[PDB]
Amino acid sequence: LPQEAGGMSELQWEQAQDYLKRFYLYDSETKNANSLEAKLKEMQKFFGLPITGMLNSRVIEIMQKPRCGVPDVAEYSLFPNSPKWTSKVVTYRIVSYTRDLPHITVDRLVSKALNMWGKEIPLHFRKVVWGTADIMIGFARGAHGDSYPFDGPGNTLAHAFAPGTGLGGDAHFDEDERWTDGSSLGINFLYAATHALGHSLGMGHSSDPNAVMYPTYGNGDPQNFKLSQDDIKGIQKLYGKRSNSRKK
Ligand SMILES: CCCCCCCCCCCCCC(=O)OC[C@H](COP(=O)(O)OCC[N+](C)(C)C)OC(=O)CCCCCCCCCCCCC
Ligand SMILES: CCCCCCCCCCCCCC(=O)OC[C@H](COP(=O)(O)OCC[N+](C)(C)C)OC(=O)CCCCCCCCCCCCC
Ligand SMILES: CCCCCCCCCCCCCC(=O)OC[C@H](COP(=O)(O)OCC[N+](C)(C)C)OC(=O)CCCCCCCCCCCCC
Ligand SMILES: CCCCCCCCCCCCCC(=O)OC[C@H](COP(=O)(O)OCC[N+](C)(C)C)OC(=O)CCCCCCCCCCCCC
Ligand SMILES: CCCCCCCCCCCCCC(=O)OC[C@H](COP(=O)(O)OCC[N+](C)(C)C)OC(=O)CCCCCCCCCCCCC
Ligand SMILES: CCCCCCCCCCCCCC(=O)OC[C@H](COP(=O)(O)OCC[N+](C)(C)C)OC(=O)CCCCCCCCCCCCC
Ligand SMILES: CCCCCCCCCCCCCC(=O)OC[C@H](COP(=O)(O)OCC[N+](C)(C)C)OC(=O)CCCCCCCCCCCCC
Ligand SMILES: CCCCCCCCCCCCCC(=O)OC[C@H](COP(=O)(O)OCC[N+](C)(C)C)OC(=O)CCCCCCCCCCCCC
Ligand SMILES: CCCCCCCCCCCCCC(=O)OC[C@H](COP(=O)(O)OCC[N+](C)(C)C)OC(=O)CCCCCCCCCCCCC
Ligand SMILES: CCCCCCCCCCCCCC(=O)OC[C@H](COP(=O)(O)OCC[N+](C)(C)C)OC(=O)CCCCCCCCCCCCC
Ligand SMILES: CCCCCCCCCCCCCC(=O)OC[C@H](COP(=O)(O)OCC[N+](C)(C)C)OC(=O)CCCCCCCCCCCCC
Ligand SMILES: CCCCCCCCCCCCCC(=O)OC[C@H](COP(=O)(O)OCC[N+](C)(C)C)OC(=O)CCCCCCCCCCCCC
Ligand SMILES: CCCCCCCCCCCCCC(=O)OC[C@H](COP(=O)(O)OCC[N+](C)(C)C)OC(=O)CCCCCCCCCCCCC
Ligand SMILES: CC(C)CCC[C@H](C)[C@H]1CC[C@H]2[C@@H]3CC=C4C[C@@H](OS(=O)(=O)O)CC[C@]4(C)[C@H]3CC[C@]12C
Ligand SMILES: [Ca+2]
Ligand SMILES: [Ca+2]
Ligand SMILES: [Zn+2]
Ligand SMILES: [Zn+2]
């Protein structure tokens, strides 16, 4: 429903358990209807929303669309938490692709996305064609041993882990999903590469509709496609002092 929040049934109250369950890789708090009722104010913060304890934005509608695969906040066993790389130079290589598109597209799409971010951080991404790279972008089905399937085409569309020496900074995208650049038959990879690989920098969802990673996005695609003041500010929080500077 255009307003889903008060047409919210059984279905949507499970998609919330679903959606949160899939990021944490199980969370003990997200199971149980009462405990979940509290957790739902936390999930709002992962949609960027400054109101926590109200549904009013598209949030419960939009969540049923394939729009986040990578966790927005990172909880991962076996490691100390830190969304940062340790070097001044990082590397990239597309190690498997969606075979609906030819490799030459999927290769270079990520090269745009990492260069968009690239400019404003103390970090350089160089491309390598010898072996493994720092960031491995791969395409897979959800049968390959990790927690929970990607579905097929539709609901949920990737997984990725925060920057670590080997295992981290890397992504697996859904290959049964349909992706695109300009040809429109898919989800646009130019945004989805940028949003995936930006959680690697530590970033969140915005509440400003001008910002690259606004989830409740409506009709009007960015034609040049650029970072805004809020998106530049999202990097300044990482390599400066932390401050929220959104206002009303
Ligand atoms: C030019 C006149 C002088 C000629 C002799 C110079 C000799 C240099 C000898 C040492 C060469 C290797 C140096 C190297 O690996 O530097 C690494 C840095 C990155 O260090 P990085 O990991 O960012 O900082 C370390 C911090 N840590 C441990 C916390 C992660 O930086 C790099 O990773 C970026 C540089 C990569 C170089 C790759 C090879 C380019 C050869 C190009 C030539 C092809 C034919 C023209
Ligand atoms: C020495 C540095 C440059 C090497 C370039 C030539 C390499 C030719 C093959 C040499 C022996 C390579 C052995 C090898 O591992 O090949 C596989 C790589 C892919 O590594 P990766 O994509 O990680 O493989 C993933 C899949 N896996 C894990 C199941 C193996 O795939 C390859 O590396 C094949 C790449 C073919 C296309 C290379 C295009 C180069 C630029 C052409 C410029 C065109 C400009 C218009
Ligand atoms: C040097 C002057 C050249 C002048 C070129 C002038 C413009 C020519 C355009 C030719 C376009 C070929 C169309 C083609 O079938 O591409 C097939 C694909 C490339 O995928 P692509 O079409 O980029 O995207 C398709 C995405 N999809 C499935 C979601 C619709 O790729 C393949 O399936 C693999 C590669 C096939 C190579 C085709 C090129 C030779 C075709 C004629 C072979 C004649 C042999 C006698
Ligand atoms: C002074 C002399 C100058 C002479 C002219 C330059 C000659 C060398 C050109 C090097 C390639 C430059 C053209 C090129 O990048 O084509 C890429 C396209 C699509 O890339 P895409 O990003 O979609 O288009 C890029 C440009 N853009 C965004 C501004 C529209 O690619 C395609 O759409 C191809 C789709 C079908 C085939 C897919 C698989 C191809 C495999 C490789 C076949 C063998 C090539 C040796
Ligand atoms: C003699 C040479 C003659 C050539 C004639 C043409 C000369 C150039 C004319 C203009 C060409 C395009 C200029 C350019 O910067 O294109 C960048 C593109 C697309 O950027 P895109 O994000 O679409 O637009 C960028 C601007 N933004 C963020 C504000 C929207 O981004 C790319 O297309 C990505 C490129 C990936 C390159 C893949 C190979 C990378 C290097 C690998 C090296 C390995 C070690 C050797
Ligand atoms: C077989 C393979 C052989 C490979 C040979 C490779 C030769 C490589 C030469 C590389 C020379 C690079 C020079 C340079 O400083 O480039 C970058 C800057 C802009 O960097 P910027 O985008 O600010 O990123 C800065 C650093 N960051 C990420 C850590 C914040 O650049 C600028 O500030 C000035 C830019 C002037 C135009 C640059 C070219 C743009 C069109 C690219 C066309 C490619 C046609 C083939
Ligand atoms: C043999 C090398 C001798 C000279 C070596 C000089 C030092 C080179 C490293 C300079 C370090 C400081 C500047 C810096 O970080 O610039 C980085 C930028 C952006 O990195 P980033 O913003 O991380 O964008 C990553 C994507 N990438 C690598 C595909 C451009 O990179 C760019 O903006 C690239 C701009 C285009 C340069 C034109 C390269 C043309 C290659 C044509 C290859 C045709 C091969 C047949
Ligand atoms: C004036 C025009 C100026 C044009 C400047 C264009 C930029 C030139 C950049 C050269 C360096 C780029 C390095 C690079 O990142 O290549 C990107 C891709 C593949 O990267 P790579 O990671 O090897 O791809 C993964 C492995 N793969 C292909 C098996 C799936 O590369 C490809 O996917 C390969 C593209 C088709 C190249 C085919 C050439 C066949 C030569 C055939 C004759 C061989 C000798 C008999
Ligand atoms: C003046 C004194 C110096 C003389 C010149 C020295 C130039 C050396 C440039 C070396 C470029 C390649 C560097 C490289 O290490 O690539 C390694 C990868 C896999 O190595 P791997 O052992 O998997 O990882 C090595 C690095 N490690 C242990 C730190 C993780 O390797 C691969 O993935 C590809 C292996 C096949 C490479 C084929 C290279 C020649 C291509 C020949 C034509 C193609 C034939 C099909
Ligand atoms: C006929 C043609 C065959 C192919 C010719 C290629 C000739 C190339 C000359 C220019 C080489 C340019 C490629 C280059 O940058 O090689 C540097 C590589 C690593 O580059 P880098 O960008 O660090 O790769 C990083 C990859 N990562 C993130 C997984 C660690 O460095 C390495 O990883 C380590 C060095 C490995 C090779 C050392 C070779 C020693 C030869 C000793 C001979 C002794 C005879 C007794
Ligand atoms: C004798 C008559 C000669 C007539 C000359 C015509 C010259 C046209 C120059 C235009 C330069 C515009 C700047 C540029 O880099 O434009 C690239 C565009 C779009 O980049 P971009 O919007 O990222 O493409 C995304 C994918 N798309 C279009 C499917 C949505 O790329 C595209 O949308 C596709 C590229 C179309 C190129 C048409 C020219 C083909 C080369 C003709 C060479 C004639 C030599 C005599
Ligand atoms: C010899 C030296 C070579 C210098 C080459 C420099 C090349 C610079 C290219 C940099 C990248 C350009 C990308 C570009 O197309 O931006 C478009 C913008 C905004 O377009 P937008 O409204 O975002 O739609 C953009 C997508 N498009 C192009 C596919 C429809 O378009 C604008 O906002 C409007 C532009 C209005 C220009 C009216 C005239 C300004 C003065 C021109 C003076 C030229 C005298 C020769
Ligand atoms: C009678 C028959 C007529 C024939 C008609 C043939 C078709 C003519 C139209 C061809 C299509 C033109 C499309 C066009 O507006 O492309 C503009 C592009 C990028 O615009 P942009 O706003 O960046 O689009 C962003 C990418 N998008 C749409 C995918 C989100 O612009 C570019 O990417 C800029 C390319 C040049 C970049 C220059 C960068 C280096 C400048 C320094 C150069 C020094 C040279 C010495
Ligand atoms: C001279 C004539 C007799 C032969 C002409 C050969 C042309 C150049 C074409 C036709 C058939 C083409 C291949 C088809 C098969 C593919 C798969 C394709 O994979 S994708 O997943 O990148 O689309 C990569 C290119 C490649 C190897 C093509 C290269 C280019 C290819 C050899
Ligand atoms: Ca899916
Ligand atoms: Ca890694
Ligand atoms: Zn997200
Ligand atoms: Zn995986």
Swiss-Prot record:
Residue numbers covered by the propeptide annotation in the UniProt entry: 1-75
Main enzyme class: hydrolase
Pfam families the UniProt entry points to: Peptidase_M10, PG_binding_1
Catalytic activity: Cleavage of 14-Ala-|-Leu-15 and 16-Tyr-|-Leu-17 in B chain of insulin. No action on collagen types I, II, IV, V. Cleaves gelatin chain alpha2(I) > alpha1(I)
Subcellular location per the Swiss-Prot or TrEMBL entry: Secreted, Extracellular space, Extracellular matrix
E.C. number(s) listed in UniProt: 3.4.24.23
Gene3D superfamilies according to UniProt: Collagenase (Catalytic Domain)
Residues holding Ca(2+) 1: 134, 166, 168, 170
InterPro entries, alphabetized: M10A_MMP (IPR033739), MetalloPept_cat_dom_sf (IPR024079), Pept_M10_metallopeptidase (IPR001818), Pept_M10A (IPR021190), Pept_M10A_Zn_BS (IPR021158), Peptidase_Metallo (IPR006026), Peptidoglycan-bd-like (IPR002477), PGBD-like_sf (IPR036365)
Name of this protein: Matrilysin
Gene: MMP7
